[model samples]
Target: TPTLGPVTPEICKQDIVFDGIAQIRGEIFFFKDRFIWRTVTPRDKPMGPLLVATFWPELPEKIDAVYEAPQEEKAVFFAGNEYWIYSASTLERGYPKPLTSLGLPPDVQRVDAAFNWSKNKKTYIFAGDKFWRYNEVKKKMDPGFPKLIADAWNAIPDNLDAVVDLQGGGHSYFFKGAYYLKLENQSLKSVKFGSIKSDWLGC
Candidate 1:
């Protein structure tokens, strides 16, 4: 079977709907259905909407969420009730386990978005109206978590479309519908309101 490559500029010109967005090892990855587009750098040209199965033959067609596991040096892909970890272009062994195996609650079957906050070194997973904070060192969810998104994150609405942690800066970006929120100085602020096509893709 031939391997799929980067999405062409022509295809990118049309309406492109991304399921999730994440940054791993300085490369930004855009997830859409079963494909993933990788950029050389945060603002550089993208390389692929490559087949997810090309790297992980056992992964599902739809990716629910994706984020980098900095401690393990791998990218974690979530779908339904399971997840898979990949190192570089190689998929790790013994995966596709229940979400609970990752320290998430049993009721939390799916994650809408996720990102590793480098400053505090914790992974945050968003699902429905709540979010969980996972402590990497302790390898477990922090106690008294699964907090309401609106309560913990100021001004952030329910059901986030996507999210990514900004490197260096003590802030994170949240996306929903056509607007975005920035969590800075321990507060979520309504930073920008615009279409992804116009603001992000430069279309």
Candidate 2:
């Protein structure tokens, strides 16, 4: 414990896999278990392993997914079988609501990943190997969803860990483990792969 050669918490160690990612408040935040990190490379000082419990109240230790709903400048976070809406650091009251309230199938216990699709203005909720679409306009689920991932976004792996849709939806990033894929223009041919560590986390 006396060695000072760059001692770091296990949460910030190399090969660490990010559990969730979001561009909240104009900056990127990566989440893992109970800690949150502000950037992979900020071009200056290290930003995190910030403790999430200390920052956002009622948020679980392990977040399964997160996505920004830009309309109200709010963030939606998922953990266990419920979701929480946060306006910056504040968790809106009556939250940690059930996924079923969001129209997810009752059998699906947890979210694998989720994102806001700018192309159709709908939110894509992923679970297991199938996916569902939520109508942001109507505030409900569209009919005949829960489609297989193979039916759409071919070559994209199912059971994704998290996703990020860049503003205006020109493209989005799909992440799993330490690897990621870029989906541009919603084109299957536009998919490309890279390491989240070297590319996103700068590790």
Candidate 3:
């Protein structure tokens, strides 16, 4: 019954940045290193530290960021310089591709966060202080992207860990270390919120 990834039970005990955050079927998933947790709501009880590879074996042990494609409900995960797309725990064929496939520059090796903005139906990808927008409908990256993240969301700091947008429930969340930045979707701005332990994790 050995799983592919580490099972760090003490994840609930730490103050750290999550490796990824995304919504799948309205359920929020928190990722760290090789484990995952599911929660019904931000303030709801979390249900894991489960080995991610136990359910999705194709994924690498470490995930950098993740986001759900609203139209397809397919999840995308990033790590190192590559990415993977999955549907219902099934890896999409011809995946584990380079970040450049999404139109990111080759030098931009890793992604920090991503989220689909339901208002405009665009997927936003982040890395360091820059961000890119991908047009799902058009099936391509938008022109004139790699914009300064601070210039767009003045309140949200750079170098994020992950992002979770509630698909336009009027709020989104930007993660960093132990705390998160609460984003009001309407204004597209954010402010620091509570701890990873107290607000999430149910610790």
Pick the lDDT winner. Answer: 3
- Tell me the tens digit of each residue's lDDT in model 2 across 1-203: 58533333553356776778877766678887778778532323347777888768688668888887866778899888999998888879889889999988778888888888877768898888899988876889999998998787757788788888767337778887778888885564646788776677665
Q: Estimated TM-score per prediction?
A: 0.84, 0.87, 0.90
**Best first by lDDT, ranked:** 3, 2, 1
Order the numbered candidates by TM-score, best leading: 3, 2, 1
RMSD of 3: 3.3
Task: Provide the clash count, candidate 2.
Answer: 0
Per-residue lDDT over 71-165 for candidate 3, one digit per residue giving the tens place of the 0 to 100 score: 88898888899999999889999999998888788899878889888778899999899999999888789989879988977578899888777
Measured by TM-score, the strongest candidate is 3
For residues 1-203, could you state the per-residue lDDT of candidate 1 as single tens digits? 89775443332477665778888787777777667777754444577758766766777767888888779778888899998888877877787778998888778778899988866779999999999998877878899888998788777778887888856566677877655666674544555555666655544
Q: Provide C-alpha RMSD values for all models, in order.
A: 4.3, 4.8, 3.3
Lowest-lDDT window of 10 residues in candidate 1? 4-13
Estimate every model's Cα lDDT from 0 to 1: 0.76, 0.78, 0.82
Judge candidate 1 against the unseen true structure and give its global Cα lDDT, from 0 to 1. 0.76
